[PDB]
Amino acid sequence: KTIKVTQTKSSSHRLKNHKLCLQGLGLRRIGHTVEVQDTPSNRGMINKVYYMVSVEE
Amino acid sequence: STKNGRDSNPKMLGVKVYGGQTVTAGNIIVRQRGTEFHAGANVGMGRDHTLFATADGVVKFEVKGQFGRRYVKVET
RNA sequence: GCUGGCGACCAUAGCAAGAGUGAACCACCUGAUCCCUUCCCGAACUCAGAAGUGAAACCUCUUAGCGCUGAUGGUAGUGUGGGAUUACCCAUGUGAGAGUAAGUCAUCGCCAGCU
RNA sequence: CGGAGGAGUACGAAGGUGCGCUCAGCGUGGUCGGAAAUCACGCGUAGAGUAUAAAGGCAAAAGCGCGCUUAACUGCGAGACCCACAAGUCGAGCAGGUACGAAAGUAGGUCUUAGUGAUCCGGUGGUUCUGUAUGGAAGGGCCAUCGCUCAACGGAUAAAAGGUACUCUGGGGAUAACAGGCUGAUACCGCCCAAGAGUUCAUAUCGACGGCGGUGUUUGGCACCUCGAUGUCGGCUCAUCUC
RNA sequence: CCCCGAAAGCUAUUUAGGUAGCGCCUCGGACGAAUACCAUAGGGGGUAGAGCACUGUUUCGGCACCGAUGCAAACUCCGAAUACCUAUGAGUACUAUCCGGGAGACAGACUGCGGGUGCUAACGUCCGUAGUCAAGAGGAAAACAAUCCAGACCGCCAGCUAAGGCCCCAAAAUCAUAGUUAAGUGGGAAACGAUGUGGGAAGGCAUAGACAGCUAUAGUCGAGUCGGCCUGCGCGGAAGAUGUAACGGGGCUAAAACUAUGUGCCGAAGCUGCGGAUGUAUACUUUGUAUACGUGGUAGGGGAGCGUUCUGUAAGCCGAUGAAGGUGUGU
RNA sequence: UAUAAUGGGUCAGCGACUUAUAUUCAGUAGCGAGGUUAACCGUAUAGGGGAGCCGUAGAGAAAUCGAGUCUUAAUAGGGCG
């Protein structure tokens, strides 16, 4: 029902919507791990920033 | 010396209210130089081919008729 | 089942060719007296009527001839990340146009006449 | 200081309305008459037209005729578009008075987008506003309207050209002339293909039409360094490197 | 000392290196989900591509038309991805909006992508869009604002990593397994030239005897031989001025080069560990306390303080048992 | 900008957002539908001095009306309150 997402790269130079996706998932720094509901709305934000996150499914 | 170098001010034409939005009577829907869109139900046409709403409701676009004209109407 | 009027829809519904229809309906049809009419003309519009014909017209049926509709697969393009700089390659998402197989001689509604 | 064109108007009908009508082209015949005037019948087909440039449009034709007419009205105006301001644009609907229709109705100029000029100062018409003691008046206000190539078109004044090598000040390497830098069109040098010339014979020596590079001596392009100064055309003296 | 933090744009200007309104910054007040990211649903398009149905333009046939065949910023029978507008919804986040006090700024630069101009020149010039610098330190690039990794509150002789690396200068593999190169290619470049070498798919001739050589098609001999296509890495083409000077250097050839795979390690002011300070908010319903999130900064805006001279407090308090001032030391 | 762009040979002392008036906003204090005096008098920071100023009502060019008022033929509509 829930998945864990970890930020693996810096977000300082990314696109505005990509930074907002990270913030809307709740990730705050490199190495941060959060646990979020497994819903299509959360999956969209995860997929948009796939290149700098790691999902423990 | 070039013989060119002129242009006119912009006119800001285009669609102002898209399909599925709600309107109040008097709202402008389409600014257009000619009749690219035609007025359906509850939609009026101005002297410069502007399309506006004459009733409150939801805007809907369609293609209709024997000529395939584009129509925009308002559903109450 | 045939005919007429008004609509939905706007070619898979259209054009073209061929063939049928007169009981009623419709169409031609008679001539021009009064209504009405032509920058001339009863050609159209209009009136008053049934001596003829379904010839033309309009409708109905048949035909893939012209047209129209049209996959699947592939190709081009393209958002994000990475690698390169004649404008490509990889991962991921998306995906035409043209062409090919194939389809089509429409489908419904309201009212009124004639069997 | 990119590529192409237009405007500084026109119209009392070329506006309103009711009714009515379709273009252009080609082919056949028909006196002058034919490439192409007008008549008649067909064929296929928006290729015509829309006062004017282009674009977006145009069958209920927005194109084209006829009769009657003045809605090219007055007071407005829900609601929007556009927008720094000042401005600009569309508008259903209500009241009064009209025009055309038998009528449902249509009409607040023209298919639309250019045809324009703020404020100040003055002129004209109107006005149940004001009126320096009072009654008037003059003057002022309000409503309508007139006088701009103020075109450098947000218009500094009602009113304005030149010289300076006799010159001066405040600034700029925000910006030119020298040298440096980037670039290499141009310049110079090299290579590829090879029609042909060479009595025969492309390549001893040349080498057309075309193609690919190198260098950083020319003419240039750019404006990065220097304008609180990098101060030189040639000659003299003295050089050092490349091939 | 603490907190936040721009712009080099639009419009107008006898304006262009000035200024004004708007855009962007800050502070106070009001008001709280009205906001944003993502998903789903609704919507218009005429760009990329493509095409020849219009407008132009193009070649070859047949008789302006018919059949084949190309092209287009100002062509379109067609036509995306993205972007944009609206409604609903989960989660996350101090979001959105309104009213006022104070500004600064209106010389930008480079890089990637889409273009105009220029010669598909320029560290050239003018737009759109994103990142960085400007106003940003650290690590990697030999050195190198604008590239890559990453956003510095303070202290530590603790640990893990990113980009990039692991023979020595100089931290970490002279690590492991397969190949390729002989050019110091690696560690600058084109048309073009060549039996350099590795791999691959076909084809021709041949032990009733092939290719070359050799004797007059036959003959000695005794197996392969021949000519092309695709592809990996190399070679020539390749000339400049101060001094090797086109791997940073030393040096490197079953590499310390290139290609593929794997196991470890080094590596930053990033992350973690320990100690300390400070801002904002929630709850403790004084507290000065815990928790959560923050603390790079130019022009600017806001907040809080240290010292100096003078007036009152002061006819007080300190001072020849030594004031102010000067010069050392400690804290 | 290490810049081969500007300025400074060094030390000590001096050297640049002030003052008056008006106005607006914010803090703070008094009073509060009210608040407050100016010149001046005054052996005088007191106490007197209410002229004046701000607030308490808008609309309209104005005359005028007034919680309404302007525009209009309109009690419609619309603008400011």
Swiss-Prot record, chain A:
Its GO CC terms are:
cytosolic large ribosomal subunit
Any idea which GO molecular function terms this record carries? structural constituent of ribosome
Q: What is one process in the GO biological process aspect for this record?
A: translation
Keyword ATP-binding listed: no
Record has Amino-acid biosynthesis as a keyword: no
Question: Which of UniProt's keywords are assigned here?
Answer: Ribonucleoprotein, Ribosomal protein
| Signal peptide start-end | none
Listed under subunit, the entry gives: Part of the 50S ribosomal subunit.
Q: Which family does it belong to?
A: Belongs to the universal ribosomal protein uL30 family.
Q: What is this protein called?
A: Large ribosomal subunit protein uL30
Identify the species of origin: Acinetobacter baumannii (strain AB0057)
Cite the source lineage: Bacteria, Pseudomonadati, Pseudomonadota, Gammaproteobacteria, Moraxellales
UniProtKB/Swiss-Prot annotation, chain B:
What GO biological process terms are annotated to this protein in UniProt?
Answer: translation
Q: Give the span(s) annotated as Disordered.
A: 1-12
**From which domain of life does this come?**
Bacteria
Write down the InterPro entries for this protein, in alphabetical order.
Answer: Ribosomal_bL27, Ribosomal_bL27_CS
Q: Name one GO cellular component term.
A: cytosolic large ribosomal subunit
Q: Which residues cross the membrane?
A: none
Question: Which UniProt keyword terms apply here?
Answer: Ribonucleoprotein, Ribosomal protein
Instruction: Tell me yes or no: is Iron among this UniProt entry's keywords.
Output: no
Gene Ontology terms for molecular function: structural constituent of ribosome
The stretch of residues making up the signal peptide is: none
PANTHER family under this entry?
A: LARGE RIBOSOMAL SUBUNIT PROTEIN BL27M (PTHR15893:SF0), RIBOSOMAL PROTEIN L27 (PTHR15893)
Sequence similarity: Belongs to the bacterial ribosomal protein bL27 family.
Know the name of this protein?
Large ribosomal subunit protein bL27
